[PDB]
Amino acid sequence: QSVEESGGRLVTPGTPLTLTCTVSGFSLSRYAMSWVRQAPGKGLEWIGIIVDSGHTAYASWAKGRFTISRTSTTVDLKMTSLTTEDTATYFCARETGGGAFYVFEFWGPGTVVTVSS
Amino acid sequence: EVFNATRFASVYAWNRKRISNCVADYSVLYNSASFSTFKCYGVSPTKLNDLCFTNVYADSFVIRGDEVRQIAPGQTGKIADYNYKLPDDFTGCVIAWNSNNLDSKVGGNYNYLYRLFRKSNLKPFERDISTEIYQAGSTPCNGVEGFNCYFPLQSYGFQPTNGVGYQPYRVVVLSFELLHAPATVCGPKKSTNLVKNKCVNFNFNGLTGTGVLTESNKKFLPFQQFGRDIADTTDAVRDPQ
Amino acid sequence: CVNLTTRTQLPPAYTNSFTRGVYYPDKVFRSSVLHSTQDLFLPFFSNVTWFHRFDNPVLPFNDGVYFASTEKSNIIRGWIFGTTLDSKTQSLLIVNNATNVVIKVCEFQFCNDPFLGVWMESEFRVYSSANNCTFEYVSKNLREFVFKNIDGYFKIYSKHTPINLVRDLPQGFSALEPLVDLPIGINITRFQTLLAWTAGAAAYYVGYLQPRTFLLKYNENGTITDAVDCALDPLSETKCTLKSFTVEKGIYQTSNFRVQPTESIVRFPNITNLCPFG
Amino acid sequence: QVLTQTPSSVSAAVGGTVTINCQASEDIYDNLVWYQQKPGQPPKLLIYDASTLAFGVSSRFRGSGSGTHFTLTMRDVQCDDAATYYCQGEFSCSSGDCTAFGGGTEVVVK
Ligand SMILES: *[C@@H]1O[C@H](CO)[C@@H](O[C@@H]2O[C@H](CO)[C@@H](O)[C@H](O)[C@H]2NC(C)=O)[C@H](O)[C@H]1NC(C)=O
Ligand SMILES: *[C@@H]1O[C@H](CO)[C@@H](O[C@@H]2O[C@H](CO)[C@@H](O)[C@H](O)[C@H]2NC(C)=O)[C@H](O)[C@H]1NC(C)=O
Ligand SMILES: *[C@@H]1O[C@H](CO)[C@@H](O)[C@H](O)[C@H]1NC(C)=O
Ligand SMILES: *[C@@H]1O[C@H](CO)[C@@H](O)[C@H](O)[C@H]1NC(C)=O
Ligand SMILES: *[C@@H]1O[C@H](CO)[C@@H](O)[C@H](O)[C@H]1NC(C)=O
Ligand SMILES: *[C@@H]1O[C@H](CO)[C@@H](O)[C@H](O)[C@H]1NC(C)=O
Ligand SMILES: *[C@@H]1O[C@H](CO)[C@@H](O)[C@H](O)[C@H]1NC(C)=O
């Protein structure tokens, strides 16, 4: 069970970007993918989660500017209208088993998305 | 119609159904693996097909998935002390299983309620239906909704994105009792094949004995079962099957 | 409900029970053997009450009832049992309506004059309330019945027979076979009949049972043909002793005669040596 | 809906013990998990359900607490335990924003 993702780039504010998290060694339709982010030197923040069935959930602080999509082996999330405070490190975490949501036992390498001029 | 029906009630209005004049079969209940939890107190479920009870009471309600541990004798909690209380010497058990596929909605199933406030703990096997607003201040609330007048009941946020503990679960509890009345509800026991003309050890509804069960055209016996002789000897018996 | 008072007031009449009221005590089969058993029976040549005009008062239910009825239009419908009949205690119910047999053990709220009204039946005013029920069930000529209630079992024995008589209970023998065994634990002390404007000429006899010993005769096919009461007269006791229906010439010993005490006396010496205590 | 961790920073010797308290603003029963995040490394699940140790972790980490108060204590902390710890627990769905993370605490061993 190895989880990895990539897509970190330097973009201007307001420019959409896509990060793709790829599964490996397990079935995606059985476990729930979730995204967490942390600012440099700051605490963990929760972005959203997708369940194995396909339903989506988000966070109030996100205000509903993110979008989580599912497919064969590419759990991808897209945002719109980025600000200058979104420079952080993004993560996609795996679950332990059926159910037992919000456990986050497996983690990826981690990718950094920076917004500047 | 009790374990899986199309409409189940809330915890504060649990449906109670009397099961009587029934040839109960708990073996199919045991062999069913679709139930998340199945454990009984006082009587082991293995030999439930042997004991006979005068009446059976079944209560059905839907609670939170994590709230299943409170439904037990000697358990203190929120739903236990305000919705459903069991006696310490309760006879029977609960059977619960996951039912998210029907009891959870994407927008939130708000058709189920549970009580959060009451003046005092309710006695075991008690129902409370009054929706009076629980007061906590000095001035009478007089039923007017507002500040310091808390509504005793709230709804569950049953959604597919909730965790396993927060997922909806269907709970059915059966109870047994014994009193000064003939027993009516128990298992059907079994029945073997019939072998004739050989020395066997028969058993016809308590007619314990041995002999060769030859075929005889004794008489009509329009409604009789046994057959006797000058002494107390069961000369002939009538097949039950 | 509805009160009807246009009934002439007459004392009940009486009739000899003759040799009626013998039922199969158990479910065994015997042939060509005389069996002597003890059970609740109706004594031979007893005094059976006779009712009628409509008559349907509340009668005691101590141990049993030999309920007989001769009719030509089946005016009698059913029965009602219980102790208080005011929803304070459980009460049984039986209605043999045009549909089927209806049996219930709900706690009813009866009116003082239960009855039915009727060609088409239209009036049903036997009870007003029915709540906290427990049990349910659906199932020229004389229809005689025997009721019992022992170990919480409510047994009913029934038998039908044709008769050319008009106003006499036939002098003959007819065994009664079991019908149903209700496993309901009620303690019943009183009961009342039911009837269904129009007035029908119907009458129903009532007898009472008590512990007695009988000598029943089973024929080749296992059907009871004759019975001998064991306390009717000196001759009947002799037949019990020899276990035969015919007794040869001679002198036989049957039982024992013993005088019973009348009054009890206790004597002690003159009460003296009283403690002063003053 | 609100998760608070105290103290923000705490230090102890190698032959010492420290306590970390994470309190939930809502009743969550026993649904709370802990993580340990080394600098520059992904966090590692340490305790789930607030009382069950994760696979492959040491027995010197223990958790307790139920309802709204939870406590995690390290016994005989080594120089390998210098990292940051976070508490996470569900907050229902209609009741709270799914799940929120705690503020976290920093542990340094001299
Ligand atoms: C039928 O008769 C009974 C008894 O004669 C009536 O019951 C009485 O009702 C009055 C009400 O005015 C009470 O004061 C009595 O105490 C009742 N007596 C008994 C024995 O119940 C009943 O009301 C009558 N019903 C009709 C429709 O006439
Ligand atoms: C002293 O006590 C005795 C009892 O021990 C009293 O005797 C009874 O008194 C009552 C009340 O006067 C009478 O009704 C009884 O009839 C008396 N008993 C008998 C057997 O006659 C006696 O009266 C008391 N002495 C005084 C002066 O009151
Ligand atoms: C009992 O059921 C079996 C099942 O086929 C049948 O063969 C038999 O005739 C039945 N007997 C009675 C008395 O109903
Ligand atoms: C039956 O009772 C009536 C009324 O008291 C009486 O006249 C009659 O003699 C009685 N008959 C018998 C056989 O007891
Ligand atoms: C119904 O009858 C039972 C008999 O035990 C009794 O306990 C109960 O209180 C009764 N309830 C009502 C509403 O009459
Ligand atoms: C039988 O029922 C009567 C009702 O009149 C009651 O008084 C009595 O106690 C009952 N017997 C038992 C053993 O419960
Ligand atoms: C018994 O029934 C048979 C039917 O064939 C009949 O012939 C016989 O007479 C009956 N027994 C008696 C004692 O009547």
Side-chain angles (χ1 to χ4, degrees), chain C residues 199-219 221-248:
Chain C
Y204 57 97
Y205 311 165
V206 172
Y208 282 46
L209 320 178
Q210 66 188 4
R212 278 288 257 272
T213 307
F214 270 51
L215 186 90
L216 301 97
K217 165 178 223 311
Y218 292 90
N219 60 356
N221 300 347
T223 70
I224 297 167
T225 65
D226 275 326
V228 159
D229 199 348
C230 208
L232 188 61
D233 42 345
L235 182 49
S236 288
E237 274 194 356
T238 293
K239 288 175 179 178
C240 275
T241 294
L242 309 192
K243 288 263 276 206
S244 83
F245 264 59
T246 172
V247 277
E248 291 315 349

Side-chain angles (χ1 to χ4, degrees), chain B residues 170-179 181-218 221-223:
Chain B
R170 293 180 178 200
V171 177
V172 161
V173 48
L174 82 173
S175 85
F176 311 125
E177 76 267 35
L178 285 84
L179 54 94
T184 316
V185 192
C186 40
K189 323 175 166 85
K190 266 309 298 178
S191 56
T192 68
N193 194 6
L194 183 59
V195 286
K196 304 181 187 178
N197 273 292
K198 302 151 31 179
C199 185
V200 306
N201 200 341
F202 50 76
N203 183 3
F204 284 116
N205 316 63
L207 264 63
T208 308
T210 55
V212 279
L213 307 172
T214 176
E215 188 96 6
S216 80
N217 44 40
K218 202 152 192 273
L221 284 78
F223 64 90

